[PDB]
Amino acid sequence: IEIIKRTLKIPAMTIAKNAGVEGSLIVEKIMQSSSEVGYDAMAGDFVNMVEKGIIDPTKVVRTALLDAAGVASLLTTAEVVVTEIPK
Amino acid sequence: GSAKDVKFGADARALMLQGVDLLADAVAVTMGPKGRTVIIEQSWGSPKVTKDGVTVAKSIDLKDKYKNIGAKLVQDVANNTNEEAGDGTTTATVLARSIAKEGFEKISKGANPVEIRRGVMLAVDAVIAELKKQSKPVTTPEEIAQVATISANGDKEIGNIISDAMKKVGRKGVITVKDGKTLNDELEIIEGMKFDRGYISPYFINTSKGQKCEFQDAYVLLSEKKISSIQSIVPALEIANAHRKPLVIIAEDVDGEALSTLVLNRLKVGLQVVAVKAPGFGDNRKNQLKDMAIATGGAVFGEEGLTLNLEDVQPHDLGKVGEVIVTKDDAMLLKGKGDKAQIEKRIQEIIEQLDVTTSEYEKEKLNERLAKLSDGVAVLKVGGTSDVEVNEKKDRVTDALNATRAAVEEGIVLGGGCALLRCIPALDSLTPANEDQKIGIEIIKRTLKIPAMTIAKNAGVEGSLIVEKIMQSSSEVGYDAMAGDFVNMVEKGIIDPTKVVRTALLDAAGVASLLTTAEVVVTEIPK
Amino acid sequence: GSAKDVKFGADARALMLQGVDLLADAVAVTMGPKGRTVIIEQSWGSPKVTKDGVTVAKSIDLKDKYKNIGAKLVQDVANNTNEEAGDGTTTATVLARSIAKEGFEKISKGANPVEIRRGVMLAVDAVIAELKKQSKPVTTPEEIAQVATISANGDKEIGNIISDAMKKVGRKGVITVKDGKTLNDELEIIEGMKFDRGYISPYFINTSKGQKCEFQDAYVLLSEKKISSIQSIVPALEIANAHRKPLVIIAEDVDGEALSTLVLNRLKVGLQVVAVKAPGFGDNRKNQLKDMAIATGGAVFGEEGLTLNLEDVQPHDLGKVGEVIVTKDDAMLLKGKGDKAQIEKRIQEIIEQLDVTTSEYEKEKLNERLAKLSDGVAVLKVGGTSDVEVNEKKDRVTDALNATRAAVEEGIVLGGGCALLRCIPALDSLTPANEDQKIGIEIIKRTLKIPAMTIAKNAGVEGSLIVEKIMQSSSEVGYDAMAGDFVNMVEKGIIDPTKVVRTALLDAAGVASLLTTAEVVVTEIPK
Numbered sequence A: 001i002e003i004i005k006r007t008l009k010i011p012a013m014t015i016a017k018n019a020g021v022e023g024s025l026i027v028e029k030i031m032q033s034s035s036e037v038g039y040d041a042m043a044g045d046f047v048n049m050v051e052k053g054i055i056d057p058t059k060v061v062r063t064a065l066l067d068a069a070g071v072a073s074l075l076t077t078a079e080v081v082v083t084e085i086p087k
Numbered sequence B, C: 001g002s003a004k005d006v007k008f009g010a011d012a013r014a015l016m017l018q019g020v021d022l023l024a025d026a027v028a029v030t031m032g033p034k035g036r037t038v039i040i041e042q043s044w045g046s047p048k049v050t051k052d053g054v055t056v057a058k059s060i061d062l063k064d065k066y067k068n069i070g071a072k073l074v075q076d077v078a079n080n081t082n083e084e085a086g087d088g089t090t091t092a093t094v095l096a097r098s099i100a101k102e103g104f105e106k107i108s109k110g111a112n113p114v115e116i117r118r119g120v121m122l123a124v125d126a127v128i129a130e131l132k133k134q135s136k137p138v139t140t141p142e143e144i145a146q147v148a149t150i151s152a153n154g155d156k157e158i159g160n161i162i163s164d165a166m167k168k169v170g171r172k173g174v175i176t177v178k179d180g181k182t183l184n185d186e187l188e189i190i191e192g193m194k195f196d197r198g199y200i201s202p203y204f205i206n207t208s209k210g211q212k213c214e215f216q217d218a219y220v221l222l223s224e225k226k227i228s229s230i231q232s233i234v235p236a237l238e239i240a241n242a243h244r245k246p247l248v249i250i251a252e253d254v255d256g257e258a259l260s261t262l263v264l265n266r267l268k269v270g271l272q273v274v275a276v277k278a279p280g281f282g283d284n285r286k287n288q289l290k291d292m293a294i295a296t297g298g299a300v301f302g303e304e305g306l307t308l309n310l311e312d313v314q315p316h317d318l319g320k321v322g323e324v325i326v327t328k329d330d331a332m333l334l335k336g337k338g339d340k341a342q343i344e345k346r347i348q349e350i351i352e353q354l355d356v357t358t359s360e361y362e363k364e365k366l367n368e369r370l371a372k373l374s375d376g377v378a379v380l381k382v383g384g385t386s387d388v389e390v391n392e393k394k395d396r397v398t399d400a401l402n403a404t405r406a407a408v409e410e411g412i413v414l415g416g417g418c419a420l421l422r423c424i425p426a427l428d429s430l431t432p433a434n435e436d437q438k439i440g441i442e443i444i445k446r447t448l449k450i451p452a453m454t455i456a457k458n459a460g461v462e463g464s465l466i467v468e469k470i471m472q473s474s475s476e477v478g479y480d481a482m483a484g485d486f487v488n489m490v491e492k493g494i495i496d497p498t499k500v501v502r503t504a505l506l507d508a509a510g511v512a513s514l515l516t517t518a519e520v521v522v523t524e525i526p527k
């Protein structure tokens, strides 16, 4: 549960980090803000996200999280890795 | 003569930054109360474990000569900080790495790095002025204990023992740190005048329980020249025997006929006499003998200037001590009957001699003489199980003693890197003369966050969030990284010496902003 | 005897030009107010950071011996320019590279490179004559400060302190540059006659506050031989004691019986006496002793020529000083009661001694004696946080001092490479004797734009446009590359010493035009 809770910040941090600002500070200020407020990384400002039209499809967000979590949490169960000798 | 390789611009600067980054990455793990140690291989024996930043810096040299140039420059930062202040070397290293990385990032074709350096040094002068305005002088021994505890990585016992030493021998007193043979630290206070010369012959022992010669209310005969003849020792013994008082003879050497006379009168009739060599090698020996003369109220015999002779001795020319203890390896004189005005005058003479010496070795002898005259000396014996633990702990004890002396000298500020963090508004108000000086001011403004971020990062938390919360807080509030809490820093005793903070910043900024002016680097072809 | 490789013609010249190009490319990054620095690895310790063109040139040696020949020749250019002018080495380097590249480009089967060199030297003579007509003598201390500021890479404080030192000790006065222990620069002015010999014994101290001997209206005894006997020192003390005046004894050495007499009379009765060793080692020692005698109005005893003896001393043979200060490491005589005509005669003698000798080491001693007699000396202590910063700054201080001395000697011209740019019409009027001399003249005419182009190029603008706009402007107009503006150059104080410009051009042209005569290069096979 804590792994997922930490992971939930990664998209906003990565978007802010590509924008050349410090992503953790941006995410902390988003979490401290009212629920309609987010970071316009293109403009570099904290805005009402729906009024600025910075929106995502629900299906895309849930699909990306589910698909990432399944494979990666299966990967983290591994103790032995078997590979072929390169020829 | 030697064949050289030359590289230009960004490739050269990137290689130098790799060297700087490797050294700073090794040093930065040691920072703060959750810093970890560094193990350095020693060629002759057991490896060294250290939390000391300059020690880690000086132990790292790199094969790539371009990387080694940057590593050597940050070694210069750490060493200069250690020499000036005795603490803060890790802080200086991380500040230097930050300034170098930011300066290298800002170099473009239109940029003027020398003017950027001018901006950097102007910003640093503004920060140092703000730090001096922030500073508060040390008033209480509790603040002394707090400074020493913080500098000793939170060891409250080291802070307590340094504070006790400074209570006993003075805040400016002589305090030395040495190996202890036990598990725990101990503080020894050497009172009176004790020097490292024992009895000349073992026949002067009167107290067998400690194998020492103990006298009370003793005459003291001081000789700047050696005593080897009968006539130069008979009348002093006649005075001692007529007054029925013990005699202590401190000379360069007592040997031959005079020594045999002393031993014969000691064994046969029971004459209360002891003979001790005069400590020191050269002018310091004469100075120490004159200090003993002033303390005891006697006169020095066999001197060059006045030429007083041992054949003509009067009872007033002999010093008087209330107590003397002579062991095999040391002698000790207690409550000498000298004139207080003479002693104060000699102390002031020693002080004026201290004001005109810059040898950094004669100042130690002068301070030790001052301490033998006034207050005694303190010895901190550092306990431990093995040599590696004792050396590791001795590094921290020495750091705490340096930090406490610096705090006495120039005051204290908030620890945790908060002092530099509260100087950022003093940079916001600056008006840069041009764009390059603006770039330099901004480099320093970003760099001022680095110590607090590094301390927090070693504590396993996100440093940028911690620093943002600090800057949003009231000016007395900082981050206790040991407790993981936001606290009033002064009340919790998380404080730093002002001298250490300003020294680390100045020494980092100078070297690193000079480094960021480079366009060409020339190295020798490796053979 | 060693086996040799031999290359011919264009391939050999291309390899040598690669060497010249590498060294000049490294040196050229330092030019002008937006020049950057070069970091040179040092084998024994910290790397050196430099903006000095000759320092960069001398540090670069190449493995390829054909390239190393060209690099060594441009090193000869930079070193020769440094030796005769003390500045302008970077300018000389870029001029030499330009002449080498242009000359190598013009070599064909019909070309005669020796006659091309003759043309190059004729053009350079015409340019130097035009520079001498362009030149203006320095009249104001403001121009002194401007010259020193420009030569110190725009540091106005360095220009101010050099101008202040030249105001205090004269424009031809002795000014030395040394390391300072502080952050900031400081000017010390040593007035009177001060030498590096302290008191012989510490018993002569009368003022405890600085541990020094301080006398006013003192007799002075000068002895060219040692004083070790009683009767040599008694009648001088008799004169001093009868006249109730302090005595200063400057001799080769006072030791033994005479020293014990001096100390005994000092301690017991309170005789005002001090003894100082005579400075210098050899003929310089007797010359300084005679200068002291002339300044004070006394006579030198124990000399070879006149054979005056210390047993027969009269009060007129004793010098008189208004003040004497004797510390542990130095002695200082102030307000000597000598004859003004005798002092001026000695000054004229020292001047005529300077006019006939060319050893460049005893000339320093003669200048030092001159300055002790006339105006004192100046010491510039260079501040900084680290040794690398102090060495970098001291290079520029030395450059500024050399440039200011050169401007005093031979006047000033416009900076920014504009002086050479205004000499191009003096080449347009030449009538070449043949085609090869015409080619050489054209080589110099193209080379004359190189310094202004390089200064502009380092400043991140297009140098050819800048130079074209300068040449289209009135003769007082040039490019302020630091400000990026076209300005009256003399009014903004962007000026150069005439000697530096002409030295750099002559030294570059000679070596590079000789290099362009080469058809065969012989090197050793590397082992």
Ligand SMILES: Nc1ncnc2c1ncn2[C@@H]1O[C@H](COP(=O)(O)OP(=O)(O)OP(=O)(O)O)[C@@H](O)[C@H]1O
Residues within 6 Å of the ligand: B030, B031, B032, B033, B035, B051, B052, B053, B054, B086, B087, B088, B089, B090, B091, B092, B150, B151, B399, B414, B415, B416, B417, B451, B455, B479, B480, B481, B482, B483, B494, B495, B496
């Ligand atoms: N509990 C704490 N919370 C926050 N900061 C602390 C705490 N304890 C100490 N510090 C800070 O840690 C820093 C000391 O770190 P450290 O001693 O590791 O490095 P240094 O003094 O820069 O260098 P060195 O000791 O290696 O010469 C000081 O700034 C001090 O204020």
Ligand SMILES: Nc1ncnc2c1ncn2[C@@H]1O[C@H](COP(=O)(O)OP(=O)(O)OP(=O)(O)O)[C@@H](O)[C@H]1O
Residues within 6 Å of the ligand: C030, C031, C032, C033, C035, C051, C052, C053, C054, C086, C087, C088, C089, C090, C091, C092, C150, C151, C154, C399, C414, C415, C416, C417, C451, C455, C479, C480, C481, C482, C483, C494, C495, C496
């Ligand atoms: N603001 C400026 N604008 C234009 N030219 C300038 C300016 N300041 C200095 N200069 C010129 O820059 C040149 C000095 O460059 P620099 O001192 O870097 O090299 P150098 O004198 O040739 O050699 P070195 O100092 O290495 O011995 C002079 O021609 C000087 O007039």
Ligand SMILES: [K+]
Residues within 6 Å of the ligand: B030, B031, B032, B035, B051, B052, B053, B090
């Ligand atoms: K540390």
Ligand SMILES: [K+]
Residues within 6 Å of the ligand: C030, C031, C032, C035, C051, C052, C053, C090
């Ligand atoms: K230069």
Ligand SMILES: [Mg+2]
Residues within 6 Å of the ligand: B087, B088, B089, B151, B399
């Ligand atoms: Mg520390």
Ligand SMILES: [Mg+2]
Residues within 6 Å of the ligand: C087, C088, C089, C151, C399
């Ligand atoms: Mg120059």
